[model samples]
Target chain A: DDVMEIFNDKTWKLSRITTEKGKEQFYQGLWSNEAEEKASRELLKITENFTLNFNCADVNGEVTGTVSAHAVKANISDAILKIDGKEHTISISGKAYGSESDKLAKVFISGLFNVFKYEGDVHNLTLYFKDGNTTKVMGFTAR
Target chain B: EDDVMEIFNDKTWKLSRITTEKGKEQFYQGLWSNEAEEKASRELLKITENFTLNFNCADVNGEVTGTVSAHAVKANISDAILKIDGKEHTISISGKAYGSESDKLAKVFISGLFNVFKYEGDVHNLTLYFKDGNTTKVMGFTAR
Candidate 1:
């Protein structure tokens, strides 16, 4: 039997940066300040909520990450639409003015990050995106 | 190996923040008033005499450049740090930070760090949470 000798206790520091009504903050600065504000106010009608969590720990070495693949979807009837490009050729790619497989890679990466866990330590966050042609890698150093 | 968690002033530890999950744990910049300096200092001295902090620092060579053994000595602010209006405090943590074979002194310069960034901040309290559902609050200042 492995002994569970606990030393320092863990704490949950819960705080809400914005209220349940503050989804505007996420897409807060999206296109046309005036228009976004107008749209944001209208967004109050839908009401989206966002929250962040972290498990502060003094972990020496650990690998924690999650990968996800979302099938590309297309919206054919829209003007000024920045959805994926036409990709009967590219295996899992949308077209121009749309997300380059690279963009979602970042979102997928920051998604796995558990901040506030290592409160007083420096860490490096790396993001890797893979497509048929190439696997892109990016690094994020917390400041 | 057993895992551990602690909350320290990011500026002090030169730490980083990596968060994504919801409802884990978070931090705030510790705020302090000039008046509270003295009390914080006294508590640090007490900690030095008791605990041993494990630390290590390495430079480009991957050489055992700067390493700290568990000296666990604590110190707060000095007279100059206290009396100055715009001056900062040095958290004198005594441990072996670098020398591998030598009993080298481990000192974490407080003022120099704050000066380099030209940013001033303090962590009033740091709460560490574990898997078993317990909490530990480490305060930068003494209790009132």
Candidate 2:
């Protein structure tokens, strides 16, 4: 019920990125380190949604185009996610990032491809993805 | 608790050694007659060089005493419980020490007893293992 209710009718925006190495904020299409001045420009810019929408059975958002998903459950399970009509097998667990041609958007899209765990609450969500020796975490906030 | 009481009741145990992963160090050697002479020859001695523990079956009460800089420090303990299953052993002990606060070594020894999580050996020679952070420490005692 937590998974269904938390994901329904709520828009999530990428706000934070964390890894074993360090943490950075994502604001206005750029990381905190990239443009520290952008952080003070507009607080609401940090909460701007990046096209992530979920309806339990399927999800639609960015990374390339309209995204389609199958076997989406509240708990950890093997799920199929299609980005721009190309399917990729991913494991979704609990409430749980990169790249760029869009560089910033690519970083977020890369995390979706490598996500191994998921955990989220009413206002906050995190995605855990593997990055060689350490795991990387992507934080999203409901806006 | 009965399993632990059967071994500790009415008996005085003399501290023999404090063991760590690195090495084992002798403690309260003077309490054992066989090693009493060696105590005098040791170059470095602890403030609580002589420590003893007594457990009484009535109300599962216990007491520990040690000498620190020629001053006697004692603590009365109660609600001592031990739970064992298979090879695993855990213990809970609570106490208040009188005049032990100023004696760093003695206070540490007394505090270590409360953190014991496993028991080994037997009545003749017992060992209580304490989980201290990332390290395991063992306190060896000999029956008196």
Candidate 3:
């Protein structure tokens, strides 16, 4: 119930992603530094939605326009994520990814699939993931 | 404190700062650096600047991997012990830093590990106090 309540209050916006190698900031659906200032400013007019809704036994979300649904059994430190229509055994303590076709959505979903730990309260959330030999963190803010 | 062990276990702590009783402080990065202090700090960083410590419920183990003489250097934690009573904490460690014997910074760091008399801070930050003769030195670490 605590996990569900934390996700139910607000939509989430990607803030930054950090790894031992470097850090990158996200704005709209793309990395902020990838475009010129005038072009990046145009992103503010576009709608890029990211949402994660947690029910009693399930979780679902849309990354940009790509969608994913999972059967979730979660507590503070551990969780089981199983795809809704897949026959594969559930993996404990990790996330599941969908067949996201959008380029930016694929990157977002892949990062989510590697998440194994989370912290912070309703307004600010941090997801910890493993990237090769290093651990990475992704910051998200409630909107 | 049990919280200390939880913070130490399976974490790679990177050297962030070093302070001495003489009111001298050196940071790993940023800020203007003094000539002599920067040289010593750079040498220290080449030794045990990044290390990982683990407590497997019974024993305390640690390892440091770095470069010396352009060759890879590896060090281990042997004869290690940890004790925590109330707010006071003590750690005794004896190990060999497989670098050159002429390395003063390496020798000081390895010897300092055995002299840790107290510790403070949380998972994000850690400070270990060591005594060297009449002077007090502190090593600051950040969880990576």
Candidate 4:
């Protein structure tokens, strides 16, 4: 319960950035300011209208699956991205144990950081799968 | 945790765009001028103080070392640099970083701003955040 405790009180402002090369990049901003949050409603509307796609296989290389998150939680050390009301993964070990059920975890956390770090918006994100062969690209915004 | 966030949220801290005199960029930081914020939409960038920054200079000159912490500061795309000590410490690329562990008798000077770098006789720790969300960790070393 680090910064995670405040998420419910914070508005996740999602937006995208166009790189110097003209490519699109996405990031999220967390705000408690009512005016700032309200100003971002347009972006939120865009979020509601957007779709998410997360696909990857399990460690055994036999099972293929897809996952998505409805909410996120964070601490000073790490952040958790959940599909259900339970815990997901920040398993930095990748597929050491079995399959990487937490494949999208890195992107999940990075998105939170990048928004502030770059002081920019994130439009999309993709992460490498457990096998290091395939990839899972999850869409959280129209950006 | 020196109530650094309180200072930022208490006021609008700002940085001016770098200008050049001889093909080099120069920037400045401090309490943002009311005029600056009023005109930031045109000339400056106001950060909400969101994000965590960590600066560790484990080596200084050749043998000195310690660490100073900060937030809201930037160090390459390779970067928490929250300004935990806005009154005393600074986040720099190639300038002098102040030491918070000083007494009336002595002071420490941290060299460099980002990671794996070096310095020291003492260590300084700093943490900065925007209204208490994610934090930026800054560490520095002084002595040579």
Candidate 5:
């Protein structure tokens, strides 16, 4: 995927979105860096060989689509999810759609560009899938 | 007496930040001496009045342990390895204690730093002590 190219083609994993309230707080345990800046930077450069699996289920339970972990962008309550060579418009507050059944999912993706320092690279992102009436939020940073 | 903490507490040496080509950042703070830098710089001036000494060295196992004539080593300093005389000894300095209780780990707050000194030179040394007691050593050196 193009998102992988932004990292010089280094393999990376994106967190999965859950449909549970206060699920966003779960990020603290996995996204922590208390190491020295030098050590932290070194660790960030290394990439794994596996790609992260990210999906938001299929439309009508038949057409589920996948997106790169880093290829997500968000603005206010709206988001753009690009996966498997397609773009998905998503929302969590019904800001863009007024129907129960729509192609856009009620989701939030934290684009990778801003976090990684590549403004033009927006395909990389973390996906936050909301389950049930769970309140979802997206956050990213570097050490 | 603390193996790694001493290095951090020492008021003499300074840390240099570097970023690799792969966008990796690292800190390299070693046994640098102001007197040594001036001395090396002066000696190196014979070749050029204005010059910054830069070199690298390495050693393996306990086989090669010696001192460099100058200081300016930059050989893969990330591995926390150092070369003395000709022997490359693994450096244990991370603000923590290391090695097994029975292992013969030579701990010297400052004595170890002075054991081997060089100017306008760089050194890198690494030693591998396997489970079977087999040892391996590698050392590299360069002069400015």
Candidate 6:
């Protein structure tokens, strides 16, 4: 018989951290015109960019993924990143244990709610595993 | 950044700064251009807009044959095995140019700048020849 294992659900807490002011330009790359600005905003809308990789190793030396690229981007005004035509909004929250050895990862995603002029229909919802940071893991423009 | 030095007739020309090495294999991934489609499969990534390049190299068999592929057309084929030039670089497959940031910038200086190059008796259209036979046809440009 093969090794039997059951997958347990993971509960993640989110944190909205402030970006290092004035350094936003580095993340956006060089710009030149209004079209460039529009494009940059659109790309940022799609890129929701960041860098990440696995952050921990297991006892058997095999590693379970700690980081999953799930950043999202939009023109700040586009409908709150719809997937399969459904809206997915998430807030920063999670569970902590009493000196637990196996701690779940805490994923953080930040965007300018004001960047879109209005926060739209989203009112602090829960985000899914695959979202904006998804591209960092799958290497495409998605969560 | 590194210092660049060049000398001519006892005078040194401190041309810019940075230890940029030319001829380092640069991956020029671009769209299809007209000149590059010369009787060959032109794999340029663009269809229109002025192209900027001076593809320096030889033909197969190491002959001194240089072809200046000025991008006259730009086309983004959604699903077409478009031949860019005169039936030469034929086929259909676009790959990303895995080159460093500097390697790409160095290409502009090696040839094709809008600076007035005086002293020429006549504006002649000629082909430039390079060794190794590893030539560059128009890699093509695409609109963002």
Best by lDDT: 2
lDDT of 2 by residue, A1-143 (tens): 34433334666666675773454563243445544444333433544424354422211210111122211111112234322111222243222221123344545555555776567778886767875676787777776
Model 2, TM vs. native = 0.34
| Tens digits of per-residue lDDT for model 3, A25-136 | 5434344454443443353234453434322211121001111322122112113342211221112234443354333444445566676566656688666676567666
lDDT of each residue in B1-144, candidate 4, tens digit only: 222322222132222222222223322232234554435433312343312223332212221112233332232122122112233333233333433422111110111133212111112232211111132222221111
| Tens-digit per-residue lDDT, A60-110, candidate 1 | 231111111221221111111111112111111222222323222223223
Ranking by lDDT: 2, 3, 4, 5, 1, 6
Which portions of model 4 miss their true places by more than 4 Å? A1-122, A126-132, B1-11, B14-144
Give the C-alpha miss distance for residue B23 in model 1, angstroms.
38
- Point out the higher-scoring one by DockQ: 1 or 4: 1
Best by DockQ: 1
At residue A52, what lDDT does model 6 achieve?
23
Among all windows of ten consecutive residues in candidate 2 chain B, which has the lowest summed lDDT? B59-68
Q: Which residue pairs collide, candidate 3?
A: none
**Model 3 agreement with the true structure over B1-144: per-residue lDDT tens digits:** 345444434556655565673445563232224667557646646565334344322111111111111111245453243443324444444444454433344445556666777777676787778887787788776775
lDDT of 2 by residue, B11-129 (tens): 66766666674464554322224544444323223334346665432111111111111112444343243233223444445444444443333455677777777676665887778
Under the 3 Å rule for N, CA and C atoms, how many clashes does model 2 have?
A: 18
TM-scores, all models, native as reference: 0.20, 0.34, 0.36, 0.21, 0.17, 0.17
Per-residue error (Å), model 6, residue B46: 15
Q: For residue A130, what is the lDDT in candidate 6?
A: 35
- Candidate 4: residue B92 Cα off by (Å): 14
DockQ comparisons of all candidates to the true complex: 0.03, 0.00, 0.01, 0.01, 0.01, 0.01
Better of 1 and 2 by DockQ: 1
TM-score of B chain for each model? Answer: 0.19, 0.59, 0.61, 0.20, 0.17, 0.17
Please write out the lDDT profile of model 5 over residues B1-144, one tens digit for every residue.
122122212122211211122233231122124556545533433342111112111121311111111212211112233332212223321122223121111121112222223212122221112111142211122122
User: Best candidate, TM-score-wise?
Assistant: 3
